[PDB]
Design a protein around this ligand. Structure first.
Ligand SMILES: Nc1nc2c(ncn2[C@@H]2O[C@H](COP(=O)(O)OP(=O)(O)O)[C@@H](O)[C@H]2O)c(=O)[nH]1
Ligand SMILES: [Mg+2]
Length: 156
């Protein structure tokens, strides 16, 4: 069964580890690595090997090597993490061109503390040829939706 490597990048504390834990928790209710199947439709299922990271050394090379997709998470309440995420996208686009990139707007549960416009963020992602999605890893809002999307894209 083909496994698609999917990696998590972004600043520390943006919620990478929590995003995936949430993914796994909700799926059971039917570095580190997590096996997860996104049922795209009733006909197609994508087998993801999700990787989650601890630092940035080069081990980075291995981390991203060969990845089919990547989620570059920022924190909606730290635009500092937003601008950092753009860096990560150029890293990938350059050294790992075949990888599908989705920029991920996490902590969406903090509506009122937000510092990064949703609009501004969708715009940058399109400008950079990346997908966008926002998620709340505590509510699990948008989490499954994000992985389903990337999987759609990779089928396509
Ligand atoms: N409010 C809120 N906090 C979150 C969310 N996801 C993660 N956090 C918190 O952000 C911190 C960092 O989470 P972690 O997964 O360790 O981030 P990582 O370092 O990027 O992997 C923790 O205190 C989490 O509870 C979210 O969706 N909403
Ligand atoms: Mg982490």
């Amino acid at each position: 069964t083909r496994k698609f490597k999917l990696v998590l990048l972004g600043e520390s504390g943006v919620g990478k580890s929590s995003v995936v834990q949430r993914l796994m928790k909700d799926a059971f209710s039917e570095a580190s690595f997590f096996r997860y199947t996104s049922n795209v439709d009733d006909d197609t299922a994508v087998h993801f090997d999700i990787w989650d990271t601890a630092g940035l050394e080069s081990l980075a090379s291995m981390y991203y090597r060969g990845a089919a997709a990547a989620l570059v998470v920022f924190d909606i309440v730290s635009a500092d993490t937003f601008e950092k995420a753009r860096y990560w996208i150029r890293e990938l686009q350059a050294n790992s061109p075949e990888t599908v990139v989705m920029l991920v707007g996490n902590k969406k549960d903090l509506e009122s503390e937000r510092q990064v416009s949703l609009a501004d963020a969708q715009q940058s992602a399109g400008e950079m040829g990346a997908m966008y999605h926002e998620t709340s890893a505590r509510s699990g809002d948008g989490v499954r939706d994000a992985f389903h999307a990337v999987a759609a894209k990779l089928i396509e």
